[PDB]
A paper describes a structure:
DHAR catalyses the reduction of DHA to AsA using glutathione (GSH) as a hydrogen donor before the spontaneous hydrolysis of DHA to irreversibly form 2,3-diketogulonic acid. To expand our knowledge of the underlying molecular mechanism of OsDHAR activity against ROS, high-resolution crystal structures of the apo-form, AsA-bound, and GSH-bound OsDHAR were examined at 1.9, 1.7, and 1.7 Å resolution, respectively. Structural comparison studies revealed that Cys20 is a catalytic residue and that Lys8 directly interacts with AsA and GSH to reduce Cys20.
Here, we present the first crystal structure of OsDHAR. Most of the residues were well-resolved, except for the N-terminal methionine residue. Notably, OsDHAR was found to be a monomer under both reducing and oxidizing (10 mM H2O2) conditions. After inspection of the apo-OsDHAR structure, we predicted that the highly conserved Cys20 residue acts as the catalytic nucleophile and found that this residue is located at the cleft between the N- and C-terminal subdomains. Notably, the three-dimensional structure indicates that OsDHAR contains a broad, uncharged cleft between the α2-helix and the α3-helix as the putative binding site for non-native protein folding intermediates for its chaperone-like activity.
Numbering used by the authors: 2 to 212
The structure:
């Protein structure tokens, strides 16, 4: 049936790595109960067969059983949605951008070596917006049922929490209680547990970037 190429853990080509875009695709397949074959790609040592179907070395790529491999996890989860419509993970267009600046604010703050450059405040602003959304519309981004936006956001919040605690001793404030309820719900899902990177691999993936 379907096949997906994802990043292997750095230093461990036999082990699932920490790409949040890869994990979004995997989470989507798991939540939809779609069988798939997973191919681990060492992105510092790509195989030539891989380069023939992904010439720019892009990961993830997805083959839905129609004789081609497509990149871009936005595009891939939409194709999966169209081909496997039940369970429905459609997120209403009015909530599509919820949480959309959190990952980049996180990466800027993670890499920041200046306590006064405002990167921390910018990240807290985006977390607070997520908190306000979940307080109005939760427990997931679209209310009682999980949807595509949650599966996009959860791998990203996982990086945020693991990397900021490890490298900066920083945690999401406890008063953001809806965000904490949200991450605890998502990260405890069997699909998430099955598809997440071990924390030491995720940390090893960020270490040279921090650095
Ligand atoms: Na390579």
């Amino acid at each position: 049936g379907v096949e997906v190429c994802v990043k292997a853990a750095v230093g461990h080509p036999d082990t699932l790595g920490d790409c949040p875009f890869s994990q979004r695709v995997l989470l989507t397949l798991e939540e939809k109960k779609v069988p798939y074959e997973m191919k681990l790609i060492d992105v510092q040592n790509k195989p030539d067969w891989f380069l023939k179907i992904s010439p720019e070395g892009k990961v993830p790529v997805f083959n839905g059983g129609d004789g081609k491999w497509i990149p871009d996890s936005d595009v891939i989860t939409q194709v999966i949605e169209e081909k496997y419509p039940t369970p429905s993970l459609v997120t209403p267009p009015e909530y599509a951008s919820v949480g959309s600046k959190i990952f980049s604010c996180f990466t800027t703050f993670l890499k920041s070596k200046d306590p006064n450059d405002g990167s921390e405040k910018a990240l807290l602003t985006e977390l607070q917006a997520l908190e306000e959304h979940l307080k109005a519309h939760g427990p997931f981004i679209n209310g009682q049922n999980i949807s595509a936006a949650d599966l996009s956001l959860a791998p990203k919040l996982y990086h945020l929490q693991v990397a900021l605690e490890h490298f900066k001793g920083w945690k999401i404030p406890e008063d953001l209680t809806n965000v904490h309820a949200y991450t605890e719900a998502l990260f405890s899902r069997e699909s998430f547990i099955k598809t997440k990177a071990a924390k030491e691999h995720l940390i090893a993936g960020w270490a040279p970037k921090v650095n």
